[PDB]
Nucleic acid binder design. Structure first.
Ligand SMILES: Cc1cn([C@H]2C[C@H](O)[C@@H](COP(=O)(O)O)O2)c(=O)[nH]c1=O
Lengths: 92, 95, 92, 97
DNA sequence: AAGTTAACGCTTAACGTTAAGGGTTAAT
DNA sequence: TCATTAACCCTTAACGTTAAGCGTTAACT
C-alpha cells in the first residue's frame, strides 16, 4: 500500500535483524560509511555495485536488490509524472 | 546467444522500431522527448531511465516494468563483468 | 511552515536575476552540486556558503546564517521539541 | 564579539560565565538536567564544541531563555571564525553582481 | 525537407573524504 | 566518591569529483 525504499529492507530485514550497524556493514562491504548510511536513511538508491556487494555479503541474490530498486524507482517516477505522461503520449 | 548481456536499446530496435518500422526521430516526436534521447538508447549509448520506461510502456503497449527489468539485468551484468571478481575478493560473506 | 534557505535563494535571487544554479556555482567558485543541493532544499547554508552568498548578492553573511539557524531550529524543534520538553523541567 | 573587537565570543563562554557560575551548576549537573551525556555539556563549556540546534532547545527550556538566543550566538561565532579563516580568499575569487 | 548525431551545457545521482556532534568507557 | 576529560566509535553534514540523463542548437547526412 506504498512503495518501499530498498533501504527500509536493508535496515529492518538485515541490519536490525543481524544487529549490524551501518558503519560496521560499510567496513565489511569495503565502502565508505555514508554509502551504507545514506541507503539506510532512504536518501540513496542501490547501485549495481552495491547490489553485488550486498548479495555477496548477505548470501542473498544480487538481482533481488536490483529489483527492489527498479520497482521503487518506477513507482517513484510514476507517482511523480505518470498522469502527465499518460496525458501527452497516445499509444498505438 | 554469446553469453553477453542484452542492452535494452537492441530490444527497442530489433523488436519494436523494426517490427513497426518506426523512425528513432519519429518515436521521439511520439514520446514528447528530444531526438537525442531516443537515438542514444537505440545506439546503445544510454540506459532506460524510469521516465523512459513509462513512456515506452505507454506507447508500445508493454509493461513499464518490462523495460526496467531489461535495464537492471543489463547494468547488473555489466557491473559484475567489470567488478565482480574484485568485489568477491575483498568481501567475505558473514558465514 | 519553516522556509528552507534554498527557497529564499531560488525564488528571491536566482529568479529575480535569471541566474541558473550552475551559473551561480561558477560565480561563487564552488562545485555545481553545492549550489544545486541548496536550491533543491537538500543542503543547509554552511558558514562558508553564507560568506560567498553574502559577497555575491551584497547582503550580509549573517542574513544567510540567520535564515539557516532559524530553519534548523524549527526543524529540530519539530523533530524533538515535544520529547525534549517532556524530559527537561525548567529551573523552577 | 569581544569588547576589543579582535575575536568572536564562543557560546560556551556565555554558558559557563552567565549561567553556570551565576547559578552554581556543575557541567556534569547540567548534563544530568538536560538529559545529555556529560562530554556534551563539558565540551561546550570548554569552547571545544558548538551549540547544536538540539542543544539550543535544551538550553532554552532549562534556563527559561529563548532557544534562538543560543542559535544566534553560535551562528555569529561560526560566521566570525569562518570569515577569519577564509574571508580574504573568498573575497578575491568572487566578484559581486 | 527530414533523420542522425557530435558538441555543449544543465541538472543531479553516487561516491570517498573530512569533519563535527554525540554516547560510551574509562582514565585522571 | 564525584566531576572532568581523553580516546574511540557511530552517525551524518558539506564538499568536489565523476558520470549519467536530458534538451538545445548545429552540423551532417
Ligand atoms: C535526405 C538525405 C538523405 N541522405 C541519405 C543517403 C543515404 O541513404 C544515407 C547515408 O548516406 P551518406 O553516407 O552519404 O543518407 C543523404 O546523404 N543526404 C540527404 O540530404
Amino acid at each position: 500500500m506504498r512503495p518501499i525504499h530498498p533501504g527500509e529492507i536493508l535496515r529492518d530485514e538485515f541490519l536490525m535483524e543481524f544487529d549490524i550497524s551501518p558503519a560496521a556493514l560499510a567496513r565489511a562491504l569495503k565502502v565508505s560509511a555514508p554509502t551504507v548510511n545514506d541507503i539506510v536513511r532512504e536518501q540513496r538508491g542501490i547501485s549495481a555495485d552495491m547490489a553485488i556487494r550486498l548479495g555477496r555479503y548477505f548470501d542473498t541474490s544480487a538481482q533481488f536488490w536490483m529489483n527492489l530498486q527498479s520497482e521503487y524507482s518506477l513507482a517513484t517516477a510514476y507517482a511523480a509524472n505518470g498522469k502527465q505522461i499518460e496525458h501527452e503520449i497516445e499509444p498505438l
